[PDB]
Chain A
């Protein structure tokens, strides 16, 4: 389950679980048609280390998806 297992190999310090409403920031299907992503990837839970927290958020917003939540990972 994206119910993070362990530290999810992030190492680092704290783990924040951040969910975003990703658009085709990521996951455009390789298909010929219009840069969609599966329907069930509307919200994308993801666990990142404290050191990598800021960079990721900057490139999420930059590519247009908007953060929906944020909780410390544990």
Chain B
């Protein structure tokens, strides 16, 4: 039932389903009380298209809750290829820029900071780019400017929860997944009492940020490689965070901007207080 092979038999579109079952579907044949196996708390099964409506109806009745439906063939092509991003290409802006040296930087900051969503030409931050070109600001300075912009506020903040925002923030600004439940919490409390702007500053003035990017380096991916003071399970979070080269942050998804890192998963790396 778990992770599948194949798609169809006569022909179908197999969908794999996931639920949470009562002892009504599955119980042991024991002398007392009806219980399902504790590890099949959420169970998944792959069903071809016709049997599918009948299965969902049954599951819902006897008590289960469907958690997901997704085609099997989507889910057979693995996990993302990460070769492009295991070790990236760094882009850094020099002291006397060359006229297109600076062109390189802007295109990359865009891609990285905005998480590969398209920024259309009406959309670009032109006045701010003027500034970088003249040297009035530096690459880190410019990077902070994009984050406080409406375009950044609008595709990533306004329409999703704070859990999601912060998780995106780590990916964009720091290039790495969020290590702890404390990190999520520490941030949510800051936004709540100092506002959005103070909270944005907190990733860009951090010691972690400063070491790796310094000030003239565009933030680049770095979570597919071992880092310091990183729990070990933050390397699996990175797969959940980045879905491949053609994937992007996208707020235009049918289901909306949502999570990607399970809250249960974060707790595995440690729980304390505050």
Asked if A19 lies at the interface with its beta carbon under 8 angstroms from chain B, I say no
Measured CA separation A11–B137 after assembly (Å)? 14
Is A29 touching B92 in the complex (CB atoms < 8 A)? yes
Is B95 touching A2 in the complex (CB atoms < 8 A)? no
Is B210 touching A9 in the complex (CB atoms < 8 A)? no
Asked if A32 lies at the interface with its beta carbon under 8 angstroms from chain B, I say no
Is A40 touching B135 in the complex (CB atoms < 8 A)? no
Is A40 touching B95 in the complex (CB atoms < 8 A)? yes
**In terms of DSSP, what is the predominant structure of the interface of chain A?**
loop
The B-contacting residues of A in range 15-74, CB under 8 angstroms, are 24-30, 37-38, 40-41, 52, 55-56, 59, 63
Residue of B nearest to A37 (CB): B214
Is B95 touching A5 in the complex (CB atoms < 8 A)? no
Q: How large is the interface on B (under 10, 10 to 19, 20 to 34, 35 or more residues)?
A: 20 to 34
Is A5 touching B217 in the complex (CB atoms < 8 A)? no
The count of residues in chain A whose C-beta lies closer than 8 Å to any C-beta of chain B is 23
Shortest beta-carbon distance from B101 to chain A in Å: 13
Measured CA separation A20–B253 after assembly (Å)? 46
Is A30 touching B90 in the complex (CB atoms < 8 A)? yes
On chain B, the residues within 8 Å of A13 by CB distance are none
Asked if B201 lies at the interface with its beta carbon under 8 angstroms from chain A, I say yes
Residue of A nearest to B145 (CB): A9
On chain B, the residues within 8 Å of A25 by CB distance are 210
Is A5 touching B134 in the complex (CB atoms < 8 A)? yes
B interface residues (Cβ-Cβ under 8 A, vs A): 90, 92, 94-95, 127-128, 131, 134-137, 140, 145, 201, 205, 207, 210, 214-217
Q: List the 10 closest A-B pairs by CB distance, nearest first.
A: A26-B215, A26-B214, A27-B214, A30-B90, A5-B136, A38-B95, A27-B215, A40-B95, A8-B136, A27-B216
